[PDB]
């Protein structure tokens with residue numbers, strides 16, 4: 007088992023780490039159609055999404071995806087500093103696999 | 110894949126962007142039969158709803174409608190500024206498809 | 213399609229608007245069998261309930277009842293002002309059908 | 316239907332009211348198997364539990380047991396004053412049946 | 419039934435109590451497949467996880483695992499002081515069984 011987000015991320019293909027050390031600038035949520043988009047941005051211009059549970063996700067996934075959307079909403083509202091994101095780089099915007107919060 | 114609410118909104122039919130840049134003025138919630146719904150207003154007089162699911166949309170669409178009502182409630186309670194709403198034009202009050210929050 | 217709580221409340225036969233324009237004074241919650249309910253009061257002495265979900269309710273009605281209890285708890289704890297309640301008056305305490313929150 | 320926690324308490328055998336008028340001093344929860352429970356204390360030393368779900372509980376109580384643990388956690392974190400607890404006294408720690416919050 | 423977290427911890431093999439008396443320093447969560455977990459750290463360096471759900475868990479723990487992750491996220495965001503953790507010491511990071519918050 008990995009002990010931090012950087013190690014976790016490296017277990018996967020098509021992932022990298024972004025280091026933000028900043029609060030979320032904007033939060034966007036859609037209920038429309040299949041994609042039900044959740045989009046976060048940072049003041050540096052970085053943009054990320056959370057993808058809906060879909061054909062590419064195994065069943066344990068479903069709850070973790072909902073949780074991650076919950077986390078991003080509360081993080082945004084509380085102005086909590088995001089340390090790092092682990093993202094899939096083969097989607098645009100890059101899709102969030104994990105988040106760390108510190109400071 | 111869109112990267113912001115304006116581009117997301119343009120993919121949908123008979124929608125439009127309202128730019129509020131304001132916190133929500135009032136929040137209304139009903140549990141009464143077949144009117145299980147939520148209405149928000151803004152100080153400029155604008156009124157919007159989260160539509161009742163019906164029995165016709167699918168399970169993930171259900172979850173997203175619940176999440177949107179959760180978002181509106183917490184936005185209202187925290188006085189979070191709503192940047193834009195993407196809404197369908199064919200209902201009165203207009204039904205919300207998406208929301209962005211930013212300062 | 214109603215646009216505010218007063219017009220929603222008017223759709224029904226046994227309902228009435230109460231105008232509080234005040235924070236909730238007390239919040240009570242029970243897990244005891246057949247009394248899985250919430251009760252709120254205001255400083256003017258008014259008492260209202262969220263009804264026990266029985267076998268008469270369908271899922272979406274049970275979901276909206278759970279949402280209403282969630283709303284009332286966080287309204288209590290944030291000292292949010294309650295504008296109006298739509299209640300069924302054929303129950304003691306009167307049972308909540310809808311809530312509106314505004315300053 | 317009862318209009319307050321005292322009257323609700325009295326509908327059940329093996330219960331009593333404790334009047335705290337104080338915030339929760341500590342909050343404990345467990346995911347360990349067969350000990351999926353919460354425990355709260357007050358500054359005067361008094362200990363109370365939310366029981367592990369079991370054969371004593373009817374199905375309607377399962378959502379309410381979860382809701383109670385959610386209420387105790389957020390009451391704790393917000394330092395909300397607990398007015399009264401209705402507890403079963405045939406268990407140690409005494410088992411929460413209902414809570415009221417007021418100033 | 420145990421009266422406090424220390425006594426609860428003593429009922430299980432491969433556990434120990436850590437007394438932190440400190441806020442959470444960092445919070446990490448993942449949605450990545452087979453790593454649907456959370457990781458927290460303290461300023462003293464200690465690392466803990468909420469395990470991926472697995473064949474070690476019984477059905478009654480599934481809700482409590484989700485709850486614990488909720489707990490840890492909101493504790494972190496509110497800077498709540500963690501008093502003690504009860505953890506399984508046969509895993510790295512050590513796996514959370516129970517948490518107490520006080521002071």
Ligand SMILES: COc1cc(/C=C\C(=O)NCC[C@H]2O[C@H](CO)[C@H](O)[C@H](O)[C@H]2O)cc(OC)c1OC
Nearest residue numbers: 244245328329366371372373376403404405406410
């Ligand atoms: C089965 O035991 C009794 C049932 C009843 C009647 C019905 C019932 O529904 N009781 C629930 C009580 C039990 O569940 C509660 C949670 O819901 C809680 O855990 C209580 O500690 C437990 O006794 C009355 C009794 O004394 C006169 C009983 O003796 C202990």
Ligand SMILES: COc1cc(/C=C\C(=O)NCC[C@H]2O[C@H](CO)[C@H](O)[C@H](O)[C@H]2O)cc(OC)c1OC
Nearest residue numbers: 347348431432469474475476479506507508509513
């Ligand atoms: C380690 O295996 C033992 C199991 C048992 C019996 C029950 C048991 O361990 N239950 C759950 C422990 C496991 O699940 C936990 C989550 O619930 C958690 O993941 C733990 O790390 C894991 O060991 C007894 C032992 O000592 C005599 C054991 O040590 C060899």
